[PDB]
Structure 1
Amino acid sequence: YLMGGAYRCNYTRKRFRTLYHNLNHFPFPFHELMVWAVLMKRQKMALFFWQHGEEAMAKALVACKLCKAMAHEASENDMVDDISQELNHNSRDFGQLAVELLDQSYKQDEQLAMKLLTYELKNWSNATCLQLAVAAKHRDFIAHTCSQMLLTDMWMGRLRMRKNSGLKVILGILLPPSILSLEFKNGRKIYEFYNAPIVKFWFYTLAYIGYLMLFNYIVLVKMERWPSTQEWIVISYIFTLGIEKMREILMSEPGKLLQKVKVWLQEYWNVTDLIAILLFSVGMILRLQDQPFRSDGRVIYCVNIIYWYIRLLDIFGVNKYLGPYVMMIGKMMIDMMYFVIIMLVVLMSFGVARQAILFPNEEPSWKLAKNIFYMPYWMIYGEVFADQIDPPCQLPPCKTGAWIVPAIMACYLLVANILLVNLLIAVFNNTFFEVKSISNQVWKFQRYQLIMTFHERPVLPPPLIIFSHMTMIFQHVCRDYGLKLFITDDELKKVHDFEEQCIEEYFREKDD
């Protein structure tokens, strides 16, 4: 219950249940001893038990996750609020121990360090160290150099092209004969090329670019009574994308259909995609009707194309420099919202004053609510036309107190364009280093999720993914790498010896 949905402790297995039914020993006693010390808030005992035995990094990550879960449970049940602080401190200590051990292992030997993070852990419900670190939301562990290089190796697949990627992958996708010219890591070459995560990502990117081109074409030119070929291709793309989203919902982690909906709705992109697909379905339904409903469907298409243009930032978030910038944009959006509230108050004040002064004989109409916001808002973006505001009133009679409007305009412009915008620039300037560092760490953490979700995806892009969906139905009646790495007993022994050497060297260096 504390670890997660997919975790399976050895105590609840059928073999241990049968052994405990008629009541031996434990192969690794320090695992159970450290779990006991962690569950009972004995930090010194847990730290003593951590450095004895094998799988030190796995024990550190498991202890960090357990302490975090216990802190959350204690804070939920209104404890003394000092237990929660102690548990959070314990979790931070164990996370720091894991990070320092990883740093020592990577500094000593690199290949064995990578082998440490991917080999399957039989004692911990068959989960690698990367999965334990991700399940603990440990951002400083995934953002380490060794974890990043391992993720790059997983992302590149079975290819060794490391000089200039992307262009060669694009050439291979566009020229299938050009595939048999790339070096591979130690017929089947095509299967290894089309199953790498990077090739799947570029296939999806090219399909999305073509879909955007077709959407622009169908909205720009005149729409006839019945959909043209490009409109049918766009509708097919939307339908297959919706089917793929439903398939991803179905194969989530929880065992209930209603519970998987919440977990899938955790991310904002999924919610926005669902809303956009529903809106496109409504617009397509309204499009196949008479003329006014056809126009309404066309307008819905235009709004939807705004969203699908905006969604290119998700694709851009794979570049090393275009992901942190997008997350910085997100946080600066919150700050800009606060300052927009104040500017809106000032703008409403000026607009109401000018509208009331200049036009004193207006009947109640909804056009009054438009003149308040429209002109003062366009005024602060350079459209400061001084004949439309305070007109020179042969000449028409001057309204009573119409000389106040230019003075109020001067004060409003001085406040809006010299004070608030400069203060906003200062706010963005003095809170940039922290936001930049946080964005870098979060992007390096989410690289793992990107790689995993493109490793689990099918090969064909959504325009022609309907073939891959039918094969799953046909195979319904019937991880060597990418997730784990299975090794023999000699390799396991060598890994254990290397880890013990690393931890004893780390403690010796710390003491010295």
Structure 2
Amino acid sequence: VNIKQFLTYGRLQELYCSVSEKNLLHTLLLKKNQERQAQLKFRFTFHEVSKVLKDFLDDTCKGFYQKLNLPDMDRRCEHPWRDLFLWAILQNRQEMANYFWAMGPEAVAAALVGCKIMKEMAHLATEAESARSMKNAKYEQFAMDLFSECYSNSEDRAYSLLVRKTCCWSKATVLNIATLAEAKCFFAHDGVQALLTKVWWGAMRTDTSISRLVLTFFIPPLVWTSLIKFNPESATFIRVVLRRWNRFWSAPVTVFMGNVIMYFAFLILFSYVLLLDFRPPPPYGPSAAEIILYFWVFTLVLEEIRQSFFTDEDMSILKKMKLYVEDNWNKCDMVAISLFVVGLSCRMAMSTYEAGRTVLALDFMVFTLRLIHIFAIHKQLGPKIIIVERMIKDVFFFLFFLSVWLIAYGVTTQALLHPNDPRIDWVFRRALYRPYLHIFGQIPLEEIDAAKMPDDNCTTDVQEIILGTLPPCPNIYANWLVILLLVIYLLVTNVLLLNLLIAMFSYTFQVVQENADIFWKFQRYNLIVEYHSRPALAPPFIIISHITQALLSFIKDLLERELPSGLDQKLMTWETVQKENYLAKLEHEHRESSGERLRYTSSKVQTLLRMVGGFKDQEKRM
């Protein structure tokens, strides 16, 4: 059977129409068909398949079947193994999909696509057993093992395989598909990390010492010395010195360094303006340092705009905005920008001056916390960010129990101690703020224990309590009960509930620390990619880079590169050979396994018993 001749588009559509009607793919195709019928022979059509694929990849299946809209039904599929793999993946058939992947040309990209589709469908997950089998798909492992084989083979063709635009997946890069699939374990591969290190250092050699690089950063003229080794490849002298300077000052590591230093400078200036040089409204004018801070934040806004609208390429504006706002650091920045603008606006008026100063203090808090993202560069600091996020989630869930318990205890103690205090603010103080402070050692027994209550001048008159002339007299009717409740609260809260939260923290830390390497390598990938696409200048100076880019656009890649047809075909054949070698080694390993040997021995012993019995009977005939 020749699959190239066997699989026509009509045949493929017939296969898509022959879905068992008990699996998720049939339901999804039914929903697509119902939507199409509402908006406007074969039960299902390639339009429905394209829409279903769009709900899992949304960029990869660009005109897989919409190109001709519908293609000729007697025409053979241009990518038969790709189509068969996609069809066998959409319906949770993993063995068949494994076979189709083993016969397919672009296997790393196919495996990453399969892992993405498996996780998205396990998010859909109509059933639960299918969802569990689809959680353990092991396609990212196929991609990782094939790429390990490829990287061990050549280590230079592996990088090109990482960055080349695929032919079977609509010019999508393997790294693009891994990002779409969120394949954290693939990004943690040694080959991917090596390519990331090569991108990180740019023109310099990756073995460059940190001390030499920092010292050359702080002494720019020393870059023309041989202190920093660079990778191979009047007017000439100027050109070569400019080339050396640009190659050093364009590397993502130096851009990162400069951005970190200028962010420290920005925080220092922000703190100076907020704490020492915050002047009255424009009647007495903002200080010059404040205007410098305004310009700095304006350049930050320009950088945000560049990242949200003019990032790297041309897509839908809405798609680019969605990609921008999907990053949590991006929305953190947006919050900081909005807070600064509101603060500045309120500060410009006398009646809102204090509110503006308050909002600006909160904005400094937000910017300083924003500074945290640079810790992903270090293995010992990166994973702790993820730990802190999960631990914040743990705190959020613990807060339900804490709030219920504190409401009960605080209202009971407020009723027992100050039944005649009408003021609501003091009700909430004594009911929640004081019990919360008990957790951290703040136990004011002079307000709770009668024997410790001072002889202060106190009133029982409600009007005098409301007026605030004298503090209310605490009720000591049954003070033993108040003290017993405080003892119980101290035990329960401070030991039991606090250590329940701490045990939750410990479990979270243990779970993240088990996978610390993978998490940090994914973080490092994201940080290196972020600073590789950034302009070489740090804000405020980034205004120069923005102006230069705009002027270049008006007047007139390391990753995701397009290859010549011959080199592309050579790479595809090389990867196919690597996949064949990997599968052959897997088969050989399987054959020599203990279970396989046991099965072979038992079967052959059975055959030997039968044939030896026959031979013995024949001999006994003689």
Which one has more relative contact order, counting CA pairs under 8 Å at least 6 apart?
Answer: 1
8 Å CA contact 1:354, 1:405 repeated in 2: yes
Equivalent pair of 1:70/1:87 in contact (CA under 8 Å) = no
**Partner of residue 491, structure 2:** 414
Q: Which amino acid aligns with 2:425?
A: W
Q: Which moved more, 1:116-125 or 1:218-227?
A: 116-125
- The aligned counterpart of 2:101 is 50
State which of 155, 158, 163 in structure 2 corresponds to 1:110. Answer: 155
> Aligned residue for 1:179?
223
Tell me, yes or no, if structure 1 residue 215 matches structure 2 residue 274: no
Contact preservation (8 Å) 1:119, 1:487: no
Name which of structure 1's ranges 194-203 and 48-57 shifts more when overlaid on structure 2.
Answer: 48-57
1:97-152 deviation line (CA, Å, top 9, x unaligned) = 22221223334443443343233334433333222222222222112222222212
The answer on 1:289 being equivalent to 2:349 is yes
* Pairing 1:31-46 to 2, within 5 Å after superposition: 31=82, 34=85, 44-46=95-97
Determine if the alignment matches structure 1 residue 355 to structure 2 residue 414.
Answer: yes
Task: Work out the CA distance in 1 between the residues paired with 2:256 and 2:553.
Answer: 26
Using the size of structure 1 for normalisation, the TM-score is 0.85
| Equivalent residue runs for 1:489-504 within 5 Å | 489=566, 492=568, 495-504=571-580
CA contact (8 A) 1:346 1:412 kept: no
Tell me, what secondary structure is at the counterpart of 1:265?
Answer: helix
Q: Does 1:248 align with 2:334?
A: no
8 A Cα contact 2:267 2:368, kept in partner? yes
* 2:329 counterpart of 1:269: yes
Indicate conservation of the 8 Å contact 1:380/1:416, yes or no. Answer: yes
What's the CA shift string for 1:45-95, capped at 9, x where partnerless?
A: 5433433464332333344445556676x75xxxx6489649936x92433
1:355 Cα shift? 2.9
Q: Among 226, 231, 238, which residue is 2:290 paired with?
A: 231
What CA distance in whole angstroms lies between the structure 2 residues aligned with 1:456 and 1:205? 16
Q: 1:497 deviation in Å? A: 4.9
> Match for residue 246 of structure 2?
191
Assess if the C-alpha contact under 8 Å between 1:339 and 1:424 holds in 2: yes
Match among 459, 463, 467 for residue 544 of structure 2: 467
Q: Structure 2: 5+ residue runs without aligned partners?
A: 1-49, 233-241, 457-472, 589-622
Instruction: Please point out which of 178, 184, 197 is paired with 1:152.
Output: 197
CA contact (8 A) 1:280 1:300 kept: yes
Q: Give the aligned residue type for 2:360.
A: Y
8 A contact 1:155–1:196 mirrored in 2: yes
Asked if the contact 1:161–1:183 (Cα under 8 Å) also holds between the matched residues in 2, the reply is no
Q: Distance in 2 between matches of 1:40 and 1:370?
A: 58
TM-score (norm: length of structure 2): 0.71
* Distance change >3 Å, CA 82–CA 386, structure 1 → 2: closer
Match of 1:510 among 582, 586, 603: 586
Matches within 5 A, 1:26-175: 30-31=81-82, 34=85, 44-52=95-103, 54-65=105-116, 81=127, 85=131, 88=134, 92-165=137-210, 167-175=211-219
Deviation at 1:221, TM superposition (A): 1.1
Structure 1 Cα separation of the partners of residues 440 and 168 of structure 2: 64
Larger deviation, residues 101-110 vs 144-153: 101-110
Equivalent residue number for residue 435 of structure 2: 376
Q: Which moved more, 1:452-461 or 1:334-343?
A: 334-343
Answer yes or no: is the 8 Å Cα contact 1:328–1:439 preserved in 2: no
Question: For the residues of structure 1 that align with 2:161 and 2:186, how far apart are their CA atoms?
Answer: 13
One-letter code aligned to 1:342? F
Deviations 1:440-481 (A, max 9, x none): 433322433322222222121121222222223322323x42
Contact 2:295–2:540 under 8 Å retained in 1: yes
Deviation at 1:153, TM superposition (A): 1.5
Give the CA deviation at 1:331: 0.9
CA contact (8 A) 1:120 1:484 kept: yes
In structure 2, the residue corresponding to 1:417 is in which secondary structure?
helix
Shift of 1:199: 1.4
Report the Cα offset of residue 207 of structure 1: 1.1
Which residue is 1:203 aligned to? 258
How far the C-alpha of 1:325 sits from its partner, in A, is 0.8
C-alpha contact 1:193 1:199 (8 A) present in aligned 2 = yes
In 2, distance between residues paired with 1:408 and 1:324?
42
Q: Secondary structure at the match of 1:361?
A: coil
Alignment of 1:288-437 (within 5 A): 288-290=348-350, 292-391=351-450, 392=452, 399-437=476-514
* Aligned-partner SS, 1:381: coil
> Which structure 1 segments of 5+ residues have no match?
none
What is the CA distance between 1:324 and its match in structure 2?
Answer: 0.5
**Which is further off, 211-220 or 254-263?**
254-263
Report the Cα distance in structure 2 between the residues aligned to 1:161 and 1:322, rounded to whole angstroms.
21
Give 1 or 2 for the bigger CA radius of gyration: 2
- Distance of 1:485 and 1:296 partners within structure 2: 54
1:447-466 pair list within 5 angstroms: 447-466=524-543
Say whether the 8 Å CA contact 1:194–1:459 is kept in structure 2: yes
Mapped contact 1:64–1:92 kept (Cα < 8 A): yes
CA separation of 1:359 and 1:11: change in aligned 2, threshold 3 A: closer
Is the CA contact 1:197–1:455 (under 8 Å) kept in the aligned structure 2? yes
